[PDB]
């Protein structure tokens, strides 16, 4: 399969990170995560695991033949800069950067505090 | 007997010429009820901020009328009932 334009979805939680490359129309081509890379336990939060997952995803996307990608990133900042830099250095170039995080409009109710 | 300003947004599939005939037909009821004074203006076909009813265009029309609360409420209900329209807004022109 071949597509000229691509889109990347990346997000780092407080204790996990996942990266996926998707067709601009929505269909996904490949995905990777530190879990697939083979890190267990609290090691997920480490930025190096996110870097490895991003490298694997980029290599798979290159295998399928993706040239340009757009980034739609979200989530709390854990491996933002390292992940984006590794994606850039893997052989793909990013045209625009957009930060779209889901911000609730004072709806529902947050969980209790931790003691 | 208070000054009222109303705006109505219309879908794009209809032609521009047929718009006003509908407007006077709709407002005839208020005209014949309280002997009201009306002024009309038509200017639309502008990009919409977001998506409404799976439509990307609209027609903006503003009308100034002085009538009863009963008449204006009836007009609002009828207009909302009609399918050709999307949304209707009514507000006072005076301080309150």
């Amino acid at each position: 399969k071949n597509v000229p334009h691509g889109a990347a979805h990346i997000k780092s939680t407080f204790n996990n990170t996942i990266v996926s490359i998707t067709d601009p129309q929505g269909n996904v081509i490949a995905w990777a995560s530190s879990g697939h890379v083979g890190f267990k336990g609290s090691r997920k939060s480490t930025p190096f695991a996110a870097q490895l997952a991003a490298e694997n995803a980029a290599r798979k996307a290159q295998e399928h033949g993706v040239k340009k990608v757009d980034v739609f990133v979200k989530g709390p900042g854990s491996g933002r800069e390292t992940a984006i830099r590794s994606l850039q250095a893997a052989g793909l170039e990013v045209g625009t950067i957009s930060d779209v995080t889901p911000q609730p409009h004072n709806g529902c109710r947050p969980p209790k505090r931790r003691r | 007997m208070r000054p009222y300003e109303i705006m109505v947004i219309l879908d794009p599939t209809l032609d521009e010429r047929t718009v006003a005939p509908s407007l006077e037909t709709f407002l005839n009821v208020i005209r014949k009820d309280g002997g009201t004074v009306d002024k009309v203006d038509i200017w639309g076909r502008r990009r919409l901020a977001y998506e409404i009813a799976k439509h990307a265009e609209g027609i903006y029309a503003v009308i100034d009328v002085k009538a009863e609360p009963a008449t204006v409420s009836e007009l609002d209900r009828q207009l909302n009932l009609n399918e050709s329209v999307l949304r209707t807004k009514v507000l006072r022109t005076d301080k309150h």
Binding site: - | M7, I9, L48, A49, Y50, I52, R87, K89
Partner: protein, 65 residues
């Protein structure tokens, strides 16, 4: 602190019609700027806020696009 230009008699009327003045008082993110920065009187700030909100509801301004 910069003076409130709307307290003048030459100031324009406040309405949701003039997209130019509606937009010039909001940030590129689509949020309403703070009193400390706009430097307007409370009444004028509130009328601007309600006017912009009505405009966003009637869909002339983006929802923070």
């Amino acid at each position: 602190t910069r003076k409130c230009v709307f307290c003048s008699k030459k100031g324009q009327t406040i309405d949701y019609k003039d997209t130019a003045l509606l937009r010039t008082y909001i940030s590129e993110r689509g949020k309403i700027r703070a009193r400390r920065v706009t430097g307007n009187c409370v009444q004028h700030q509130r009328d601007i806020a309600v006017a912009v909100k009505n405009a966003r509801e009637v869909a002339l301004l983006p929802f923070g696009s």
